[PDB]
């Protein structure tokens, strides 16, 4: 009989003694070591003293699981460990002071989101996401990528959209202070002002240029008449998205952008970031240029407080 530690958060640990003749599942339920399902595995003597992730079976473990992950979904732990088994084996090179991911298992959209998160100000609500966020910015991003897949209900290898992934992530972040007051002017219906908050205040689908959003875009009116322009914006950033089109990216006018080339869904993502010059991060590959023209679908801008003059 070996002694062992079980946990759900790797924070609050539990002393447990396990019989060497019964499998972990027969004593704890679904049990994992570093993402590897050991439910049907008998204890090895090398497993003495190690910490095992277990599915919550009592109320103390259920509460701890929520406090760290902010979910009661019983499938979360298993989807997390299943992804972790792959992401632990990816390569996370430092590219231009940023942690990227070497290409594997169609992870190009994950790497793009990982690079973007290192360049915008964001606080995650679940401690599990926040703690892994910090570890990722220091170069150890395996646990962070697995959580993104789990929180986004995505599996390793599945085809992912960066804008959808960012949106999912924003919903698990503290964006309560974010505000976007908008205005629509129709010839017949009149004028109308809408105030969006949270995730809807920081994302727009339609145009890539923040300037174009400030000037105003064409939207159909409720009576079929209109123009919609940004009045006030109170957020640490904004994300502008449009379907992949050729776009000129000028140094200093944006933070970072998503380049998408190829067919819908089965394509490939590249990350454009604006430093002292334009940089292109394609997994572990890095290229720099003074100007950039190419197929962009997301652009990220910096912000704090903006009030229009119209
Ligand atoms: C790589 C990938 C994986 C998954 C998905 N999702 C989309 C729908 N989602 C509910 C599923 C989970 C699958 C999309 C894609 C994907 O390729 N995304 C690119 C950026 C894309 C978007 C749009 C477009 C037009 N409107 N909106 C709202 C988005 N159009 C494109 C046209 C041509 C080429 C690329 C386009
Ligand atoms: Cl919550
Ligand atoms: Cl890829
Ligand atoms: Cl969710
Ligand atoms: Cl949610
Ligand atoms: Cl949350
Ligand atoms: Cl330049
Ligand atoms: Zn405990
Ligand atoms: Zn929460
Ligand atoms: Zn794999
Ligand atoms: Zn969730
Ligand atoms: Zn109208
Ligand atoms: Zn310049
Ligand atoms: Zn790819």
């Amino acid at each position: 009989t070996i002694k062992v530690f079980t946990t759900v958060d790797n924070i609050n640990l539990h002393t447990q003694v396990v019989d060497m003749s019964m499998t972990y599942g027969q004593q704890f339920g679904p049990t994992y070591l570093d993402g590897a399902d050991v439910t049907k595995i008998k204890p090895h003597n090398s497993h003495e003293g190690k910490t095992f992730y277990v599915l919550p079976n009592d109320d103390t473990l259920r509460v701890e699981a929520f406090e760290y992950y902010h979910t009661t979904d019983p499938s979360f732990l298993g989807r997390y460990m299943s992804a972790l088994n792959h992401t632990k084996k990816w390569k996370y090179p430092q590219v231009n002071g940023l942690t990227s991911i070497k290409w594997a298992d169609n992870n190009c959209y994950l790497a793009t989101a990982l690079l973007t998160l290192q360049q915008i100000e964001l606080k995650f609500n679940p401690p599990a996401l926040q703690d892994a966020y910090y570890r990722a910015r220091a170069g150890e991003a395996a646990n962070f990528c697995a959580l993104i897949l789990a929180y986004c209900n995505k599996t390793v290898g599945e085809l992912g959209d960066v804008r959808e992934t960012m949106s999912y992530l924003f919903q698990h972040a503290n964006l309560d202070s974010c505000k976007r007051v908008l205005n629509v002017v129709c010839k017949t219906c009149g004028q109308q002002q809408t105030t969006l908050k949270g995730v809807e205040a920081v994302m727009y689908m339609g145009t890539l240029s923040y300037e174009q959003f400030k000037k105003g875009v064409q939207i159909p009116c409720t009576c079929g008449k209109a123009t919609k322009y940004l009045v006030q914006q109170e957020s640490p950033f904004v994300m502008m998205s449009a379907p992949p089109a050729q776009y000129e990216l000028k140094h200093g006018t944006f933070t970072c952008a998503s380049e998408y080339t190829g067919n819908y869904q089965c394509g490939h993502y590249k990350h454009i970031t604006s430093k002292e010059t334009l940089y292109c991060i394609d997994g572990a590959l890095l290229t720099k240029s003074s100007e950039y023209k190419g197929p962009i679908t997301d652009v990220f801008y910096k912000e704090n407080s903006y009030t229009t003059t119209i």
Side-chain angles (χ1 to χ4, degrees), residues 5-15 51-54 60-61 63-65 67-69 80 126-132 135 143:
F5 304 120
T6 87
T7 179
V8 301
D9 48 22
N10 211 11
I11 293 330
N12 304 119
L13 275 42
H14 294 80
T15 87
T51 37
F52 283 111
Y53 279 81
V54 293
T60 306
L61 285 182
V63 169
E64 289 169 1
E67 286 285 32
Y68 201 55
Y69 301 105
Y80 172 28
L129 261 185
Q130 198 42 51
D131 289 349
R135 290 321 299 160
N143 271 271

Side-chain angles (χ1 to χ4, degrees), residues 251-252 275-278 289-291:
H251 165 244
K275 310 298 199 55
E276 81 275 16
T277 189
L278 286 316
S289 72
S290 34
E291 282 156 290

Side-chain angles (χ1 to χ4, degrees), residues 4-185 187-190 192-222:
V4 296
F5 304 120
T6 87
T7 179
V8 301
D9 48 22
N10 211 11
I11 293 330
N12 304 119
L13 275 42
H14 294 80
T15 87
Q16 309 285 320
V17 199
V18 152
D19 183 20
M20 226 84 194
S21 76
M22 338 168 69
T23 192
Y24 289 111
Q26 279 168 144
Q27 309 171 68
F28 292 156
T31 311
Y32 306 86
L33 215 178
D34 254 338
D37 193 349
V38 299
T39 306
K40 299 175 169 182
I41 294 169
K42 70 73 183 168
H44 300 348
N45 310 81
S46 176
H47 301 168
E48 164 66 48
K50 304 226 186 178
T51 37
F52 283 111
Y53 279 81
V54 293
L55 193 68
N57 46 258
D58 56 68
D59 205 64
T60 306
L61 285 182
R62 281 193 303 268
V63 169
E64 289 169 1
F66 178 84
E67 286 285 32
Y68 201 55
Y69 301 105
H70 292 218
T71 184
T72 53
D73 183 6
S75 73
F76 186 88
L77 196 81
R79 294 184 293 109
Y80 172 28
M81 299 280 105
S82 183
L84 185 58
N85 212 72
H86 295 261
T87 66
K88 274 167 37 223
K89 282 143 59 195
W90 293 351
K91 294 304 156 181
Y92 302 94
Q94 291 293 137
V95 184
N96 194 234
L98 292 165
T99 310
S100 182
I101 322 178
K102 198 223 261 183
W103 81 271
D105 300 337
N106 296 325
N107 65 0
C108 65
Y109 80 104
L110 281 163
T112 297
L114 177 64
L115 296 163
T116 301
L117 289 166
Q118 288 160 88
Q119 297 175 69
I120 64 185
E121 176 64 51
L122 213 58
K123 184 219 198 175
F124 286 119
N125 293 317
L129 261 185
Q130 198 42 51
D131 289 349
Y133 196 7
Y134 283 134
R135 290 321 299 160
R137 307 192 77 162
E140 265 180 17
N143 271 271
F144 188 56
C145 296
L147 285 179
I148 293 178
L149 291 149
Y151 278 105
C152 290
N153 203 22
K154 293 271 162 164
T155 53
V156 165
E158 213 168 344
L159 309 180
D161 175 279
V162 163
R163 180 191 59 86
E164 302 196 348
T165 313
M166 287 313 279
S167 175
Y168 250 109
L169 293 175
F170 291 157
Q171 276 153 243
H172 300 74
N174 192 343
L175 296 174
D176 291 356
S177 293
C178 297
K179 173 165 67 188
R180 166 183 299 185
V181 175
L182 224 67
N183 208 77
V184 196
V185 169
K187 318 272 182 164
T188 299
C189 280
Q192 185 55 26
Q193 189 139 111
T194 74
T195 304
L196 324 163
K197 293 179 179 179
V199 175
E200 310 138 76
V202 305
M203 323 184 36
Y204 184 79
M205 183 71 213
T207 178
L208 285 191
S209 176
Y210 196 21
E211 271 303 316
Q212 194 49 76
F213 192 54
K214 278 164 171 174
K215 300 189 323 191
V217 278
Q218 285 344 290
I219 70 106
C221 179
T222 59

